């Protein structure tokens, strides 16, 4: 299930993952309040802001 980063986000510790606008990523799940989601990129994984991503081809 493929998403794309809308905005840049730099990891800030606590298992967050940096993402670059334009970057593709797979989403594994959301936290309880939906504010964070667990993302897998080719070359890392960790939590990113749900609001910073959108599905591909939507």
């Amino acid at each position: 299930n493929l998403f794309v980063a809308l905005y840049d986000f730099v990891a800030s510790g606590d298992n967050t993952l940096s993402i670059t606008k334009g970057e593709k990523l797979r989403v594994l799940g959301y936290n309880h309040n939906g504010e964070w989601c667990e993302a897998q990129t080719k070359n890392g994984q960790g939590w990113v802001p749900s609001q910073y991503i959108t599905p591909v081809n939507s």
């Binding site: 905005y7 986000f9 936290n31 504010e35 964070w36 939590w47 990113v48 609001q51 910073y52």
Partner: peptide
């Protein structure tokens, strides 16, 4: 996931 808030969208 972190307990704190993510940053708002820019």
């Amino acid at each position: 996931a972190p307990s704190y808030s993510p940053p708002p969208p820019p």
